[PDB]
Design a protein around this nucleic acid. Sequence first.
DNA 1: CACCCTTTGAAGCTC
DNA 2: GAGCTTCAAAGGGTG
Length: 86
Amino acid sequence: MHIKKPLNAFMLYMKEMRANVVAESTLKESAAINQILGRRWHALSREEQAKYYELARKERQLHMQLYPGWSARDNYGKKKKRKREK
DNA sequence: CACCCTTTGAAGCTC
DNA sequence: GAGCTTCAAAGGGTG
């Protein structure tokens, strides 16, 4: 199937906190909410931060276990995308 | 109903 | 190895 890229730190931070943000705040609009995740990152102690790099790597390994050598490109260049040359 | 806007990181692609 | 480009999430807002 479209085996998604192995999500990084902030994508998990989103998955966890974003639900809470959306429950707490008036906002839903992902681009604003994601800048909220950006802000919320500043609350993470160095250890809480580190946890994400661990988690990210856990997911990375899960990806490798579920799909031995699944190379990222499940949809590379399918979305047009804005900014592009970030 | 796909892309915009946004965030970081990885990992695609390109050189 | 050094670098540039796209998807991942994601939801109203835009198109």
